[PDB]
Scaffold this active site. Structure first.
Site, short mmCIF file in Angstrom:
data_model
loop_
_atom_site.label_atom_id
_atom_site.label_comp_id
_atom_site.label_asym_id
_atom_site.label_seq_id
_atom_site.Cartn_x
_atom_site.Cartn_y
_atom_site.Cartn_z
N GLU A 176 -29.71 -2.27 18.89
CA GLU A 176 -29.24 -2.58 20.23
C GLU A 176 -29.09 -4.08 20.38
OE1 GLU A 176 -28.25 -0.93 23.18
OE2 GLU A 176 -27.83 -3.05 23.64
N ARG A 209 -8.35 7.01 42.57
CA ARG A 209 -8.99 5.70 42.54
C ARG A 209 -8.06 4.64 41.96
NH1 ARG A 209 -13.83 7.31 39.09
NH2 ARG A 209 -12.15 8.70 38.37
N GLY A 264 -24.90 6.93 37.10
CA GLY A 264 -25.43 8.04 37.87
C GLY A 264 -25.87 9.21 37.02
N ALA A 323 -24.77 8.08 23.99
CA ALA A 323 -24.16 8.56 22.75
C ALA A 323 -25.04 8.23 21.55
CB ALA A 323 -22.77 7.94 22.59
N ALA A 340 -24.79 -5.90 15.93
CA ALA A 340 -23.93 -5.59 14.80
C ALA A 340 -22.68 -6.45 14.84
CB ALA A 340 -23.55 -4.11 14.80
N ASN A 374 -24.56 0.99 29.62
CA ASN A 374 -24.00 1.55 30.85
C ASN A 374 -24.62 2.90 31.19
OD1 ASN A 374 -22.26 -0.47 31.82
ND2 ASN A 374 -20.60 0.17 30.44
C1 LIG Z 1 -22.24 2.16 37.66
C2 LIG Z 1 -21.77 3.27 36.76
C3 LIG Z 1 -21.97 4.59 37.14
C4 LIG Z 1 -21.54 5.65 36.34
N1 LIG Z 1 -21.77 6.95 36.76
C5 LIG Z 1 -21.36 7.93 35.99
C6 LIG Z 1 -21.60 9.29 36.44
O1 LIG Z 1 -22.15 9.62 37.48
N2 LIG Z 1 -21.14 10.25 35.56
C7 LIG Z 1 -20.50 10.01 34.35
O2 LIG Z 1 -20.14 10.98 33.67
N3 LIG Z 1 -20.28 8.73 33.95
C8 LIG Z 1 -20.70 7.74 34.73
N4 LIG Z 1 -20.48 6.44 34.32
C9 LIG Z 1 -19.82 6.21 33.03
C10 LIG Z 1 -20.71 6.62 31.86
O3 LIG Z 1 -22.08 6.48 32.22
C11 LIG Z 1 -20.42 5.73 30.64
O4 LIG Z 1 -19.06 5.87 30.25
C12 LIG Z 1 -21.33 6.13 29.48
O5 LIG Z 1 -22.68 5.93 29.88
C13 LIG Z 1 -21.06 5.41 28.18
O6 LIG Z 1 -22.13 5.70 27.26
P1 LIG Z 1 -22.12 5.16 25.79
O7 LIG Z 1 -23.41 5.58 25.08
O8 LIG Z 1 -20.87 5.56 25.10
O9 LIG Z 1 -22.13 3.58 26.01
P2 LIG Z 1 -23.34 2.70 26.54
O10 LIG Z 1 -24.26 3.52 27.35
O11 LIG Z 1 -22.73 1.49 27.25
O12 LIG Z 1 -24.06 2.26 25.23
C14 LIG Z 1 -23.55 1.18 24.42
C15 LIG Z 1 -24.71 0.33 23.97
O13 LIG Z 1 -24.37 -0.33 22.73
C16 LIG Z 1 -24.71 -1.70 22.82
N5 LIG Z 1 -23.86 -2.47 21.94
C17 LIG Z 1 -22.55 -2.83 22.15
N6 LIG Z 1 -22.03 -3.56 21.18
C18 LIG Z 1 -23.08 -3.70 20.28
C19 LIG Z 1 -23.18 -4.37 19.05
N7 LIG Z 1 -22.18 -5.04 18.48
N8 LIG Z 1 -24.37 -4.31 18.41
C20 LIG Z 1 -25.38 -3.63 18.97
N9 LIG Z 1 -25.40 -2.97 20.12
C21 LIG Z 1 -24.21 -3.04 20.74
C22 LIG Z 1 -24.56 -2.04 24.30
O14 LIG Z 1 -25.32 -3.20 24.60
C23 LIG Z 1 -25.12 -0.78 24.95
O15 LIG Z 1 -26.54 -0.84 25.08
C24 LIG Z 1 -20.91 5.36 35.12
C25 LIG Z 1 -20.71 4.04 34.73
C26 LIG Z 1 -21.13 2.99 35.54
C27 LIG Z 1 -20.90 1.57 35.09
#
Ligand SMILES: Cc1cc2nc3c(=O)[nH]c(=O)nc-3n(C[C@H](O)[C@H](O)[C@H](O)COP(=O)(O)OP(=O)(O)OC[C@H]3O[C@@H](n4cnc5c(N)ncnc54)[C@H](O)[C@@H]3O)c2cc1C
Ligand SMILES: Cc1cc2nc3c(=O)[nH]c(=O)nc-3n(C[C@H](O)[C@H](O)[C@H](O)COP(=O)(O)OP(=O)(O)OC[C@H]3O[C@@H](n4cnc5c(N)ncnc54)[C@H](O)[C@@H]3O)c2cc1C
Ligand SMILES: Cc1cc2nc3c(=O)[nH]c(=O)nc-3n(C[C@H](O)[C@H](O)[C@H](O)COP(=O)(O)OP(=O)(O)OC[C@H]3O[C@@H](n4cnc5c(N)ncnc54)[C@H](O)[C@@H]3O)c2cc1C
Ligand SMILES: Cc1cc2nc3c(=O)[nH]c(=O)nc-3n(C[C@H](O)[C@H](O)[C@H](O)COP(=O)(O)OP(=O)(O)OC[C@H]3O[C@@H](n4cnc5c(N)ncnc54)[C@H](O)[C@@H]3O)c2cc1C
Ligand SMILES: [Cl-]
Ligand SMILES: [Cl-]
Ligand SMILES: [Cl-]
Ligand SMILES: [Cl-]
Ligand SMILES: [Cl-]
Ligand SMILES: [Cl-]
Ligand SMILES: [Cl-]
Ligand SMILES: [Cl-]
Ligand SMILES: [Cl-]
Ligand SMILES: [Cl-]
Ligand SMILES: [Cl-]
Ligand SMILES: [Cl-]
Ligand code: NA
Ligand code: NA
Ligand code: NA
Ligand code: NA
EC number: 1.3.99.33
Lengths: 454, 454, 454, 454
Positions: free
Chosen positions: B34, B283, B47, B15, B157, B42
């Site tokens: 970060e 699940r 995947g 995101a 943050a 995550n």
């Molecule tokens: C093992 C696994 C497999 C998955 N497989 C799939 C799949 O096949 N398909 C699918 O659609 N989804 C899948 N998911 C779920 C999906 O990948 C996640 O919901 C998604 O990646 C979330 O992305 P995001 O950018 O919102 O959060 P994230 O990718 O978690 O990004 C958040 C980031 O912000 C950082 N952060 C947090 N708090 C702070 C702060 N206070 N200050 C600074 N940085 C901070 C964190 O350290 C992290 O690096 C999977 C999840 C897991 C755990």
């Protein structure tokens, strides 16, 4: 030359060996005469998988079967053209026949393995050790040697001896250019099998069983028993009811076991590049559909994804080497390659597989209602195989009662004449269910020898 | 220390990287901060399988999908607790998001491969090359370096800066013991993910998410973004809607990929030696059932027959070695052995498998209505594995509109504050369908950076 | 005014009458106090269909049920959020409870009729003569008069009397402006039902249960028992688990029985003229989907063809007259008419029904996977009805053990306090299966009176 | 007496009327000669439901059919024993034939009604106004009178006139004891139907079609056209392929429409009180099963519950009065009564229905795998009916090409001789799908008259 026994059995397959052993067990002299130089007939090259409802193997695994279910499965399988009393007697004696093989003939079945053929509501087919009929035939001849049952190979029966009263009193056979007379004091048992390897007899009762069908059986299955019995006015019925297998080698006629991927996602393609039949239809339905396609052959096509599940290429390297050597099978990287090796129109094939890929991605085969669900074929490599049908089982044959006594055309018992096995024609109907032929030959073979010995 | 950018993005997952790239692409200064020493969150260990209706991969394979089907699949999946406008905007922008990754970020998806997650009427999830989220994150940081998007790791943050008018004007972060002020002239984007690894926050909104659940995600997913935004009076909803995976390692909490035999015939057994749930349920349904069994764990049991079809033991030797070393998995020759290694009552287990063998032999699972059909388990060897559920996805989070603008408790827009990804809580409802999280974070990540940049 | 009994039961529904009769049967003085001027509560206006595995009616018809199947059906129904020991005790005592009603209370069930509610693997719900709960309540009060069980109507319990040791020693009630003290020497039984008719309590545990939900129950079901017990520090759990019925009268909130055509081909249409949910989904899934449509209502549409099969219009003329009089139901000749009476976009509705007609003609509902198969709607006339959901059952409530003893927040037994019926909250989970509430109130009502009497 | 026309058509059914109208439309003199005193043959007493893929009625209702699906449905229906070119030409001309009836003959079909016969993937059979073939035949004779097509009733064709070169030059018929010579300058069209009412011809090609089969057709369907053409050395094929209907009146042989409850839960019971076949099998499969039961008849049994859904008793009061008067149908209050009126063993019947009641309560028919699901039969009253099969359609007949030209035994065209309708034998195969006979006779009837006129 002249021999005299109580019971003269013609044919050393499963039916004859059961009749011979039961006759000797009743304290009577018996003999099996075999036309081929080897014993076993189609029972030897068979899978020897035996359908039994209520077997000890089912009990070992926790499976609860039912005899009435077995009966109705068999009757519905032959579209109720089979004799209900013949099916009932087969099913009711299946447990005793299988236990007899295990305890008397010392046949070794797997204790924790069964197979479920098409049309069977419950998995019920016993499997012999080694997945071959040779396990049964080897134990038969070993047991026959122990009990003193002589087997005369290279002895072809050619005429039934009928006396003044009409009783069948013996067999005239040919051995080493010479005429052997087999006097049968109590009975003659006809256990000669079917006529799947007799093309001219096949055409007589169905002109469509010509060169476009092979034979999955041995060369000796030529229907000698039906011609012999008919010359003394025995009745034959249902001679046109024939069982085919749709995917066979065009060269040998044998069942193409490498094409068992059909049960895992393989599709049948004609020369135009199109599907034409549900790959999981009845075997006779698929064969008839194959003969309606251009050239009267079909293609079988699958990919590595299916092989990773079916393992048919890995488990049958001999067929892989033979079919590829003969130019009837290719392994290619792309569907375009699969089209060109057999001069299939490429654009029509690519569109056909695209429809399959869509049917797999939505679960519904809109074209032929695949009952298991198609499998995606986007990735390669691919195997493509050319196949034609072959005649597998002749359900017709001699008319008998449930005591294996042969009847004439008015339905009257011909004294001293008995028949059991594929040579009879009242059990299976229009479609022989898998695993049912072995239950038939053992149950009625045993009855024949018991009835012939009295 | 003081930094000034147009857009300050918190979080280097999918995101945040989408928001950062879109902000820079609009001609504005941006930065991603970060908290962890590595980027990706995550999204990295994911995947990265992305659900798209109408993708070029579907067209390559001949699959015809529908956006309205995708929409209704997602809504029915979360039991219609999701926001219809949020689902509609996600589905309507899925094609453009996936093409953007392929053309702008240069993400490589497989051209002839898709996956169909549970609850999807059509196979529609794109698969990145290598079956890993690292393919996406590597291309993101490469692209971010090319376009000049700075990423500050080890920068956590901790406070949102709100001015006199209520506009969010920047971020206060901690880097190397020191207080960094990030002035955001145009907007702040909260892209911090979920709180699956925050046990105390989990218990706050669901006291059952304690030690009996692990976490399948990274250590940084602790819900910092929700606490930050709530202190300036942002709204959070559905914080109790949590997605679990039922078969996870009791030691690490990671998803036990070796237990994917569940999709091929593996059965779930409790300490009493009994089945307790359909192995192909939802699940969350399976996890809740596992927590109702003695000890709050389950066993997973299959044999070589299933491995010959599933290959999960062959494809995951690392899990095999770890689970066996830790005493949570055994390979045994008999079911009696499988019972004794885990002190399962032997007689009750033998009877349970006998029922399964009967259910497999008749096609009907009379006990739990297995929707695919059980598989015979008479022959060995066997693998038996001990597993517990783990929290996988926190569907709840910050309240946003379809323009990623954060709303307060009266529903009013908080100026300068945006949020996208798992940190928001209006898209998925009570059950997050597989492959839907990646469509969510890319579509709304891009929107966040576009909205923040104006 | 002051009364003294051994057991004081609050509530004259099925749970209270069972507790009262069992207390008197044990040789103790008992009394039922009822807040309303009539007895019966929701148990009176109920269908009183009672789920029993192993009932004499099943044996009469040849149906073989199983208690473990009943248990697993109920647990899977509430997504395993129910207490396994509470479900096990309910199922294990269902036969004895039903026989007790037939033999002791003299309730008349049909001998050759059962109903199969959703989520039940076997048809198992007994049906009382007349298809009404009045058959049960009438026999209860007749039996109560024979055994000397006084029922005080217009007597509202308002405070539980707790002594120095913490034991519940009586009830303070209001009757005719005056404060009645009910001294309970042995126990107090709380049998007050749920709070489906308490909108403000509904919103407290789920802010979405406001005016967009009606109530299918009586006015007295306001959750008085939970507030009373909580003031002496009793525990309440799962207060947010609520069961809804999706197709109810917008005026009264009652279940629209004329719209049972849903089980025969009727389709749900929103204001845009589109289908939005599978008409045979879970009741909570359909209600949530209805609340996601424009206006938070749905339309129900069927034709004479369906009425010829469902007969719901013929069997419910009262609803037909009321709904039509109130302008919430029309009978029209054409689909164009059906659109205009409710200002549905005509072109979008005609196209929607055309898709249904195609789905019916091919057996596959490509839009929502109708599990029974849609029915053609080309011919009229048509009925179209406007409906909204209503709260039906509050699964949450007081925390008890399998002996109906009320527990505090640390889980400790509160002496002298018992509870049974819908007022408790541990049996059903997130979804109350049909016919399960009556098994619950009779089984645990009987236990409450037996435990209170000792 | 001597007549001279361009085209002489034998038979005033659907095939002959189409040929006659097309011949006159081409500017040639034509005549239809009819053996019976009434016109119409089996086409008159037919349902006249016509299978068409791509009809205007389907478009009106929103149904999307496919010609290739129609083709493969028909081919798989006759187990691929039909001619692929004959099926393709029928399906490809079905739309034009139906539009021709609507626009030229002015046949009125229902605009919003279709029927789906067994074996059709899509509902596609058009229904004439009044649900009778009389609608078609009345419009034919009205149109024939307008265009000047003379119809000679009481004129039986008995000999084909063949000249020196082998060309068929006319017909010799019998009218009023006298020999009429019909000179055909261009062609003769054989449109005489099948031989379902010719018992001795039936036995010739299938000795089982004796008195145990009735005939659902008119008395004139005696196969005169095949005997006539064979005497000038025309080829006939597939004469043994016969279509039966299993549930017919034992007195008249007509189809028992009151027993359409079979499609709603009615069970088939033999004299022993047992079920013996899935009630929804193929019509030939059920007939063969009926002939395997004691006495070669079956019972049909249902109750008021089914009548409330099927309405077959209400819609067919004539059959109700006739069958009851003849002692072949009873309405009784109990199953015991149903057994005694037909001397069915009561205990065996009660146990059979108990199994059905269990199969209905669990959704699985363990005995015969009822594909729709059995219906409970605990409550009465009951109807029980005695039925026997009847021959319905003779798929065999004269050998033609897709231009209706008759071929000899070497396959060579016999000049001047054409045939269309049920008298030909290459279209349907081993099983005539419902609604396909009318598409066949109209499409090839039109072709015959067009080919005969040139
Ligand atoms: C093992 C696994 C497999 C998955 N497989 C799939 C799949 O096949 N398909 C699918 O659609 N989804 C899948 N998911 C779920 C999906 O990948 C996640 O919901 C998604 O990646 C979330 O992305 P995001 O950018 O919102 O959060 P994230 O990718 O978690 O990004 C958040 C980031 O912000 C950082 N952060 C947090 N708090 C702070 C702060 N206070 N200050 C600074 N940085 C901070 C964190 O350290 C992290 O690096 C999977 C999840 C897991 C755990
Ligand atoms: C490849 C294959 C696999 C099969 N697998 C199965 C299976 O898994 N399960 C199953 O149930 N069925 C199976 N069958 C079918 C089944 O095995 C046969 O129908 C059965 O073995 C027939 O046995 P039989 O004793 O009646 O005939 P046979 O075993 O053929 O015995 C007849 C013998 O009589 C001899 N004979 C013939 N005429 C004369 C004569 N005039 N004089 C002397 N001897 C003569 C023949 O040479 C032959 O040795 C299979 C068949 C084949 C071909
Ligand atoms: C229309 C409808 C149909 C149903 N059909 C079925 C069905 O077919 N099968 C099934 O299993 N379930 C059915 N149910 C649900 C089931 O009947 C109820 O859950 C059950 O009857 C609850 O019984 P109870 O004794 O616990 O509560 P109730 O029967 O509601 O008894 C509670 C009584 O206590 C009284 N009370 C409350 N507070 C006080 C107070 N402070 N002082 C004094 N008295 C008080 C109330 O006035 C009421 O009379 C149905 C429900 C409805 C509304
Ligand atoms: C009760 C019933 C219902 C049916 N319903 C349907 C249905 O819904 N859909 C469908 O597709 N099919 C249906 N069929 C079958 C279908 O209608 C027939 O196969 C079809 O009508 C045959 O038409 P035809 O013109 O070939 O023969 P016919 O209509 O039988 O015409 C033959 C005519 O030729 C006359 N004839 C015969 N021999 C001579 C002679 N030597 N000289 C002069 N005239 C002679 C006969 O008397 C007769 O009038 C039904 C059949 C029956 C019996
Ligand atoms: Cl001798
Ligand atoms: Cl023996
Ligand atoms: Cl025959
Ligand atoms: Cl700066
Ligand atoms: Cl861009
Ligand atoms: Cl919330
Ligand atoms: Cl007192
Ligand atoms: Cl009692
Ligand atoms: Cl709670
Ligand atoms: Cl003239
Ligand atoms: Cl015309
Ligand atoms: Cl023929
Ligand atoms: Na045979
Ligand atoms: Na979230
Ligand atoms: Na409750
Ligand atoms: Na014909």
């Amino acid at each position: 030359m002249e021999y005299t026994y109580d019971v003269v059995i013609i044919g050393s397959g499963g039916a004859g060996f059961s009749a011979g052993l039961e006759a000797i067990a009743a304290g009577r002299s018996a003999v099996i005469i075999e036309k081929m130089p080897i014993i076993g007939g189609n029972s030897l090259i068979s899978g020897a998988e035996m359908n039994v409802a209520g077997s000890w193997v089912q009990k070992n695994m926790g499976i609860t079967d039912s005899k009435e279910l077995f009966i109705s499965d068999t009757l519905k399988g032959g579209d109720f053209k089979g004799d209900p009393e013949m099916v009932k007697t087969m099913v009711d004696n299946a447990v005793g026949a299988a236990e007899w093989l295990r305890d008397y003939v010392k046949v070794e079945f797997y204790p924790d393995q069964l197979f479920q053929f098409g049309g069977h509501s419950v998995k019920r087919a016993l499997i012999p050790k080694g997945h071959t009929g040779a396990e049964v035939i080897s134990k038969f001849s070993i047991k026959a040697d122990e009990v003193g049952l002589p087997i005369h190979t290279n002895t072809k029966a050619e005429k039934l001896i009928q006396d003044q009263t009409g009783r069948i009193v013996g067999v005239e056979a040919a051995h080493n250019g010479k005429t052997i007379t087999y006097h049968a004091k109590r009975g003659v048992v006809i256990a000669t099998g079917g006529f799947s390897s007799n093309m001219e007899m096949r055409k007589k009762y169905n002109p469509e069983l010509d060169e476009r069908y092979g034979s999955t059986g041995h060369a000796g299955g030529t229907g000698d028993g039906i011609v012999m019995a008919e010359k003394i006015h025995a009745a034959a019925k249902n001679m046109g009811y024939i069982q085919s297998y749709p995917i066979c080698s065009p060269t040998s006629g044998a069942i193409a076991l490498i094409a068992d991927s059909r049960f895992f996602g393989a599709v049948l393609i004609n020369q135009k590049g199109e599907r034409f039949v549900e790959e999981l239809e009845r075997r006779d339905v698929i064969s008839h559909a194959i003969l309606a396609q251009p050239g009267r052959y079909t293609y079988v096509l699958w990919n590595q994804d299916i092989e990773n599940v079916a393992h048919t290429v890995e488990m049958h390297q001999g067929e892989l080497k033979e079919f590829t050597k003969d130019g009837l099978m290719y392994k290619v990287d792309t569907l375009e390659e699969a089209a060109k090796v057999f001069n299939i129109p490429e654009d029509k094939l690519l569109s056909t597989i695209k429809d399959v890929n869509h049917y797999a991605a939505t679960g519904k085969d809109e074209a032929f209602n695949h009952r298991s669900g198609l499998v995606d074929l986007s990735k390669g490599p691919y195997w493509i195989l050319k196949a034609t049908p072959s005649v597998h089982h002749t359900m017709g044959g001699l008319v008998v009662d449930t005591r294996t006594r042969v009847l004439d055309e008015q339905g009257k018992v011909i004294p001293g004449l008995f028949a059991a096995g594929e040579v009879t024609g009242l059990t299976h109907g229009t479609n022989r269910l898998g695993g049912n032929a072995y239950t038939d030959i053992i149950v009625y073979g045993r009855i024949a020898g018991q009835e012939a010995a009295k």
